[PDB]
Design a binder for this molecule. Structure first.
Ligand SMILES: Nc1nc2c(ncn2[C@@H]2O[C@H](COP(=O)(O)OP(=O)(O)O)[C@@H](O)[C@H]2O)c(=O)[nH]1
Length: 161
């Protein structure tokens, strides 16, 4: 069965770990988290890299990102800076994968909160500009979490063929 190495990138404190845990362990409270799932009727293995890789010095951080086959570009809907930083994380991913068409999904996390400084339309527009999907998620309530990772797998599959 096919394995998909997935990388979750974005500003600190936005729920990248919480999203991964919600997907793997189904609750909200070393190198990788692995989980077998059925996507589009096909059994596959998700290999989600631990985000501690984002703490590495630059050369080793590039190596960690070069390893991913698809990327969740995550921001939090109550964190303007994290949304601004999407641009900078997408440019880093393109540089390290040496490609302008990397499988990616834009994820707006913490949609359970009332404090929303980044509007849905802002994010939808950005994802349209990039030509990638946009998913709203809450790692707390689990809204959209499966949808986010499954959509990324579907994007990888289309990229292959
Ligand atoms: N309300 C809410 N809090 C969240 C959500 N996801 C993460 N958090 C909280 O945001 C903080 C940062 O989460 P964390 O997973 O460490 O972020 P990371 O630094 O991007 O890995 C923690 O206090 C989480 O409980 C979410 O969807 N909703």
């Amino acid at each position: 069965m096919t394995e998909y190495k997935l990388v979750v990138v974005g500003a600190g404190g936005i729920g990248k770990s919480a999203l991964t845990i919600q997907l793997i362990q189904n609750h909200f409270v070393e190198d990788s988290y692995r989980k077998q799932v059925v996507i589009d009727g096909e059994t596959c293995l998700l290999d989600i890299l631990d985000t501690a890789g984002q703490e590495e010095y630059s050369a080793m951080r590039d190596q960690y990102m070069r390893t991913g086959e698809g990327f969740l570009c995550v921001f939090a809907i109550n964190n303007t800076k994290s949304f601004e930083d999407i641009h900078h994380y997408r440019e880093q991913i393109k540089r390290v994968k040496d490609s302008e068409d990397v499988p990616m999904v834009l994820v707006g996390n913490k949609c359970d909160l009332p404090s929303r400084t980044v509007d849905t339309k802002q994010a939808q527009d950005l994802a349209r500009s990039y030509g990638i999907p946009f998913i709203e998620t809450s790692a707390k309530t689990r809204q959209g979490v499966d949808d986010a990772f499954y959509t990324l797998v579907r994007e990888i599959r289309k990229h292959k063929e």
